[PDB]
């Protein structure tokens, strides 16, 4: 009983954590694009 339920809990937790990792990667690259856009906006503004 300790075995099967805990192993299924962990198998579901793997998906739970991988979802948040993928979404964190998406938020990270969107942050990268945002900061690049702000820096290029500054570039054009100075020009």
């Amino acid at each position: 009983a300790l075995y099967q339920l805990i192993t299924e809990k962990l198998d579901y937790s793997l998906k739970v954590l991988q979802e948040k990792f993928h979404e964190n990667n998406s938020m990270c690259d969107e942050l990268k694009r945002k900061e690049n856009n702000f820096k290029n906006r500054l570039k054009q503004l100075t020009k």
């Binding site: 793997l14 954590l17 991988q18 948040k20 990792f21 964190n24 990667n25 938020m27 990270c28 942050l31 990268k32 945002k34 900061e35 702000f38 500054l42």
Partner: peptide
């Protein structure tokens, strides 16, 4: 996965702080 998730969260916090600083 938890370790790298925490790392990404910290980096995202830094990036958001920088964006707010320039914003």
């Amino acid at each position: 996965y938890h370790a790298h998730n925490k790392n990404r969260k910290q980096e995202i916090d830094r990036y958001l702080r920088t964006i707010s600083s320039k914003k």
